[PDB]
């Protein structure tokens, strides 16, 4: 995770404007609609059969909010992603059995969600900073897998 101060500033500056509740619901829901195989983990969530059933499902929204909340918290510790996510890593591996490739798909969907919300403000250099951040978060969430 080699972020330059200029990259870290652009990342933190854009993040200040994000409504995480709403962005979290959109990202988790879009993941489930674009990459339907990821629904394997959420069969207790109910009807996930159509785009509207996914995007409007209150359990998908509640879970997205929680996912992005842990994510925002990681943005406050960009020099210690591994430590920050150590317990979540273990949980994802030993209890929930989630293949880490899932964290990379979610990162690329987040990037598109952010582009969708901010338009022009999501410049190629800004995107580049966020690509390194989502790669870093994904690797940290996978580091305790065994």
């Amino acid at each position: 995770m080699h972020l330059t101060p200029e990259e870290k500033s652009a990342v933190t500056a854009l993040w200040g404007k994000v409504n995480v509740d709403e962005v979290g619901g959109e990202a988790l829901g879009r993941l489930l609609v674009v990459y339907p195989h990821t629904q394997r983990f959420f069969e207790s969530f109910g009807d996930l059969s159509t785009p509207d059933a996914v995007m409007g499902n209150p359990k998908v929204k509640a879970h997205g909010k929680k996912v992005l909340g842990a994510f925002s918290d990681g943005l406050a510790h960009l020099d210690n992603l591994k430590g920050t996510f150590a317990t979540l890593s273990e949980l994802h591996c030993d209890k929930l059995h989630v293949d880490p490739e899932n964290f990379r798909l979610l990162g690329n969907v987040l990037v598109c969600v952010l582009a969708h919300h901010f338009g022009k403000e999501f410049t190629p250099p800004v995107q580049a900073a966020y690509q390194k951040v989502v790669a870093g978060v994904a690797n940290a969430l996978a580091h305790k897998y065994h």
Partner: protein
């Protein structure tokens, strides 16, 4: 495989793109170059500074080929045949790179089409770019 709904979705989103295609082609490339630097190894002969003319020109060619695939959505392997031979026999771009460009095209359309880039459309556009990539890579070996 593209479904009737996917096809309808891609035509709709691409039509809103219209005469901005070329410009979005270029922006997608600049995004790819900055976010995934390994992709520059394939354009050692281009100037890749912001606003480069070579990048603009190539953006247009990429977008025009995508416009061609949308117009021949039910016959893509044939409509893109020549492009597929080119990539397989001359360019020989490693296939992971197509995923990276496709991602940057999605980010570019999201950034410019806030009202049409719904979840259902994002899904269909993503499936379309994967199919185009598959065609272009089908003759590698």
């Amino acid at each position: 495989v593209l479904s009737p709904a996917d096809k309808t979705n891609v035509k709709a989103a691409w039509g809103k793109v219209g005469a901005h295609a070329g410009e979005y082609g270029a922006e997608a490339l600049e995004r790819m170059f900055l976010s995934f630097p390994t992709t520059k190894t394939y354009f050692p002969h281009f100037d890749l500074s912001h606003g480069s003319a070579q990048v603009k020109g190539h953006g247009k060619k990429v977008a025009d080929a995508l416009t061609n695939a949308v117009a021949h959505v039910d016959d893509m392997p044939n409509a893109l045949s020549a492009l597929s031979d080119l990539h397989a026999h001359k360019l020989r771009v490693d296939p992971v790179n197509f995923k990276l460009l496709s991602h940057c095209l999605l980010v570019t359309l999201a950034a410019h089409l806030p009202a049409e880039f719904t979840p259902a459309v994002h899904a269909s556009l993503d499936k379309f770019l994967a199919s185009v990539s598959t065609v272009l890579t089908s003759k590698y070996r």
